[PDB]
């Protein structure tokens, strides 16, 4: 039993997104298939802007992460997080024991010992994670605005973030930085896992796609008294997709394209 580790780092300059991926081959003689444990990290910038058209704050309502394949060479066999989760701290662990045995735990502390393991950890304060689709060929998570703490407000409140304007500039119509959470003010550091299994000998190469991005909402404030509207799903799927080719025979992972 051994682990062959690779990494891929790719940046989309246009989107201000980084995919830092880890690809671990579990090469195990007591195991029927090849497995590739894919850990998805990097950064997805909030790209929160304050402009005039009436001030506008564009802001990330949801962060998107998915991995999908179209080949019949390859299936997803696990993914983490597996279930919806609402705590600010998301820390989980996948484990593998010789013999093709994978388990996962919804924690890191107190999660037991394995021949091999890989953890995830991210912060999502005011947001919540949903596993919008898992099939044998793909999984998609959404990290979705949930509720905000005020000097307490749903993510669907139209007046969220608007302010009796502190000045004439657009930014002065919206609450200060020390009132916004990292996922609005800075962006999201993702930490996700999926395992890819491939029946040994059933083709040397397989292909799959990892996508990172965001769905922006838009808030519009102006004094006519402050009035505030809100466009949900203003700019949806601001995303980058990176296609990878895995070579099972040589335990390699290549980039094919970045859109």
């Amino acid at each position: 039993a051994e682990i062959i580790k690779r990494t891929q780092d790719i940046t989309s300059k246009r989107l201000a997104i980084c995919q830092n991926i880890q690809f671990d081959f579990v090469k195990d003689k007591k195991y029927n298939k090849d497995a590739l444990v894919v850990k998805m990290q990097g950064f997805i910038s909030s790209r929160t802007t304050y402009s005039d058209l009436i001030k506008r704050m564009i802001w990330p309502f949801q962060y998107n992460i998915s991995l999908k394949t179209k080949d019949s060479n390859v299936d997803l066999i696990n993914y983490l997080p597996k279930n919806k989760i609402d705590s600010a701290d998301v820390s989980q662990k996948l484990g593998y024991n010789i013999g093709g045995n994978f388990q996962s735990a919804p924690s890191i502390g107190g999660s037991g010992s394995f021949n091999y393991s890989k953890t995830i950890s991210y912060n999502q304060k005011n947001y919540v994670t949903e596993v919008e689709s898992q099939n044998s060929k793909g999984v998609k998570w959404g990290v979705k605005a949930n509720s905000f703490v005020t000097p307490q407000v749903s993510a669907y409140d139209q007046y969220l973030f608007a302010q009796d304007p502190t000045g004439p500039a657009a930014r002065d119509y919206f609450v200060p930085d020390n009132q916004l959470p990292p996922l609005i003010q800075s962006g999201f550091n993702p930490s996700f896992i999926t395992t890819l299994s491939h029946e040994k000998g059933k083709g040397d190469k397989s292909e799959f796609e990892i996508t990172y991005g965001r769905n922006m909402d838009a808030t519009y404030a102006y004094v006519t008294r402050l009035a505030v509207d809100r466009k949900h799903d203003a700019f949806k799927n601001r995303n980058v997709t990176v296609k990878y080719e895995v070579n099972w025979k040589t335990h390699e992972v290549k980039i094919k394209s970045i859109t």
């Binding site: 690779r6 990494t7 997104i17 950064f43 800075s186 550091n189």
Partner: protein, 287 residues
């Protein structure tokens, strides 16, 4: 190798603890020389770590065989990436760093100063503690990663304007419809003797980059006494080929055809101002 902590009492209120840790990859010819400056400030209840990242990253370049006849190639160090990273749910943030602005000067030079009570100032050029960075990057440009945030800082040091005699500037993606990429093409002999003279290549493309980068990590004195950070040094090697086609020499440049990536992991003991090497991780890609 890791020096013991040396201690400088700056006054009744500030103490500096310095340790220098060295992590090497002999396989990649990368050597990380990290200087950890903990600043203990009796008026401020956060630990401050000024981490200086230095050492060297070999370009990956090897001289071509001068007997290559119709076709020859070289790899060269076309981009260097450095990152210093903290963990998502520890209570440590990357709060400042140098350099900060895009910079194409031949030498990057910055001074960082720590003021009593916890303020950091970064200025151009060569306060209770001071540190400097100074590195040569002729024909390259340093750019702060767009993915820098509170857990991570990165820089790319990348081939920007390379002059070939009085010709150019060339870059990684230069394309002439006839000559292709002329970056390192002498004359439009043996292929192996038709690259420009080594001394006319930027030093970062044929020898080593000597990075110097600073980051400032802030640790809250409540919760944990220990945390982990990683420091990654990486080179993208471009494959630069020259070919006789029948009529003239043309050049071609394939970006990041080989990647070499050295990540070291350190445990930081914030109470005792010590660090311990937990791990080194060599990865490579070969297109």
């Amino acid at each position: 190798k890791i020096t013991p902590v040396s201690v400088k009492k700056v006054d009744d209120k500030v103490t500096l603890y310095k340790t220098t840790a060295t992590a090497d990859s002999d396989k990649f010819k990368i050597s990380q020389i990290l200087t950890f400056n903990f600043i203990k400030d009796k008026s401020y209840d956060k630990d401050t770590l000024v981490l200086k990242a230095a050492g060297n990253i070999n370009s990956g370049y090897e001289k071509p065989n001068p007997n290559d006849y119709d076709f020859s190639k070289l790899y060269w160090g076309a981009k260097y990436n450095v990152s210093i990273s903290s963990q998502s749910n520890d209570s440590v943030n990357v709060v400042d760093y140098a350099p900060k602005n895009q910079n194409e000067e031949f030498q990057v030079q910055n001074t960082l100063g720590y003021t009593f009570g916890g303020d950091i100032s970064i200025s151009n050029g060569l306060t209770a503690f001071s540190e400097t960075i100074n590195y040569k990057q002729e024909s390259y440009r340093t750019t702060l990663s767009r993915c820098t945030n509170y857990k991570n800082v990165g820089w790319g040091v990348e081939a920007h304007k390379i002059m070939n005699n009085g010709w150019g500037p060339y870059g990684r993606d230069s394309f002439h419809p006839t000559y292709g990429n002329e970056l390192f093409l002498a004359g439009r002999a043996y292929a192996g003797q038709n690259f420009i003279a080594q001394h006319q290549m930027p030093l970062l493309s044929r020898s080593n980059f000597n990075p110097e980068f600073l980051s400032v990590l802030s640790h809250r004195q409540d919760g944990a006494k220990k945390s982990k950070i990683t420091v990654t040094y990486q080179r993208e090697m471009d494959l630069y080929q020259i070919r006789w086609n029948g009529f003239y020499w043309a050049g071609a440049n394939y970006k990041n055809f080989k990647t070499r990536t050295f990540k070291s992991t350190y445990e930081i003991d914030w109470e005792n101002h010590k660090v311990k090497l937990l791990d080194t991780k060599e990865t490579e890609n070969n297109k």
